[model samples]
Target: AGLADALTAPLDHKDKGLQSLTLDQSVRKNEKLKLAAQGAEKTYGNGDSLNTGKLKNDKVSRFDFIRQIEVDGQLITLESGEFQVYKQSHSALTAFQTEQIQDSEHSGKMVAKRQFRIGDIAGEHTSFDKLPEGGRATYRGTAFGSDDAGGKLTYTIDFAAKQGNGKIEHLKSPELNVDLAAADIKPDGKRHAVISGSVLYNQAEKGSYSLGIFGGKAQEVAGSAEVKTVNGIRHIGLAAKQ
Candidate 1:
């Protein structure tokens, strides 16, 4: 029934359903989003939060904007959004601002909070030892390719084996699933570690992926890929543990 309540509940706040695809006031109510309802949420159904259904017309990759204004009785706020691709060529960021109005604190104040990442690219890369050793996770999120595709992600890992693998549903082709070799140290070496892999699609073509661990206790997966259709089909997805 409340932020303190859910954070302490194993089922509502910690379970893996209706959660991997949402912001829900950026979890824990964060104390930053003063305007959002206790559990106010925004949904991104297998598509960019900045675009409409299976968006295909967006050609530019850079984005920055002070976003929106949404109202509903006790809610009235403006948005400030920003996104940028890194020169490192592998990191992309999605951040935002959604301000407020409220009741428990007297219709809220003129406070604005930013740092809400749509799919979570926040914090430092997880260290190898912090990685979980067992269990598989079913991830629910969007899949991007030549076009935006919709699917669930299934992944499994073993620190004991130093390997991991995963596949996206609906993208299952004879050769599209991925096999990975895990590293105890990340690509930068000064880094933590990674799950890197590749795919051979349709017998003659190929693609690859390199993912860094993210989210609650290194239990989430996100990365980039270009599994071609001879068309440079890239996928940028973040699938949370379920």
Candidate 2:
């Protein structure tokens, strides 16, 4: 009655090219199940971050950003930097729109939206929707994109979330690349990977960052970064083997 119902749960809505589900709505509606889908986020530790310092868009203003993941919880922080693109403005970011769904037959989708404050300056929206593959949920989408005072920018993130260990292929943008394979949340409550990505107008660079509850202790790991432009489309390599 527990796992079986969850495995066979129907999608909230489905019509031709349209597919969407509200995470809070579905779980609340099926109150008896007390699904683990919501709590599954604990697998991703606290302070896990994905930051794109400053992304360039042609000669226009650059876009800056950061995403902080909460430990053992679903709350996350999204921040955007100030810019001067046709106008000068800035705002604090907070989650607005939220959606998550997984079809019994196998398609899954999740959308996270952030709205700027101090007068509704603008919004940054991301969509992740994919089907189950190899017994894991595969998510690939433009995790971040906005064309406001910050100029035009987009961040494409691809990762697979399993019950325990998972992988992140390439969190790509016009000027950022990353790869991590078989990384998992350990009992120590810490997990991190080598960094590899390029920043526009600058030579490709590399560095590493840690994620999880550090308890005020920190350390560093070193790595390299690279990118190839083939047939006009950029390509980043796969996550290093564990």
Candidate 3:
């Protein structure tokens, strides 16, 4: 109900193309965020963070940058560094604007919007019985950073054991890379088996990852990750059976 739903949730009035949600409207209508405007009301360098916490304590200056996971249980908190970008001088980032690094940093701070790459979840899972090629297999594909960069990805699952592992390599964005330690995949509905694991970026810093298999029989896999190396980085990618 959660990790699966988070992928398909609306960022704004999808049909409208641009909802231009005011600060007040965003807090009220956003399914994932419950926020406060700066004073009288109420709220960076965007140091990226994607932690789902029990407390809804993070802040974003604009609506498009705002994403809520599940206010019902935990919140997908957006954490950033010290600098910030304002809509007063420039426009908000729209979909597919991957090349634009809208946020900058000083003293390791970058306040900015994000690119989730959710569109990678292109396959739909089928009944467990439909998943052929049982024992173990690896899914692979090119990886892309939300800030417009690329790398390599692999997700390996031992279907019979319901255990899995994966990794991202050669991510040119600061050379950030990660590998899952130990993971367990659980079925979500009739589609997408999900996994959560603590990862080690570049075999050093602590991080976390979640991947879900798609296609009726593990044809594709995609998911999001958060790593705190140079502060933090949040991005998503996909892979295919290999």
Best by lDDT: 3
Task: Provide the lowest-lDDT 10-residue window in model 2.
Answer: 85-94
Rank candidates by lDDT, best first.
3, 1, 2
Task: Give each model's whole-structure lDDT.
Answer: 0.38, 0.23, 0.44
Expressed as tens digits, the lDDT of each residue in 24-128 for candidate 3 is 222223433322222211121122211111111111122223333444565544432111111100011111222123233442233554334332232244344
Tens-digit per-residue lDDT, 1-242, candidate 1: 23222222233333321221222323223122221223433322222222111111111122333223334433332333433211111122232333322323543334444332333332245667666666444433333332233444566555555566655556444233433223332433645556667644443336666666654355555555545554345444434343
Please list the residue runs of candidate 2 whose C-alpha ends up more than 4 Å from where it truly belongs after superposition: 1-134, 145-175, 187-205, 209-242
Per-model TM against the reference: 0.43, 0.19, 0.49
Give the higher-TM-score candidate: 1 or 3. Answer: 3
Error of 1 at 159 (Å): 1.9
> What lDDT is reached at residue 224 by model 3?
55
Local accuracy of candidate 2 as per-residue lDDT tens digits, 87-115: 11111111111222232343232234433
Q: Output the worst ten-in-a-row residue range by lDDT, candidate 3.
A: 85-94
What value of lDDT does candidate 1 attain over all alpha carbons?
A: 0.38
**Cα lDDT, model 2, residue 84:** 18
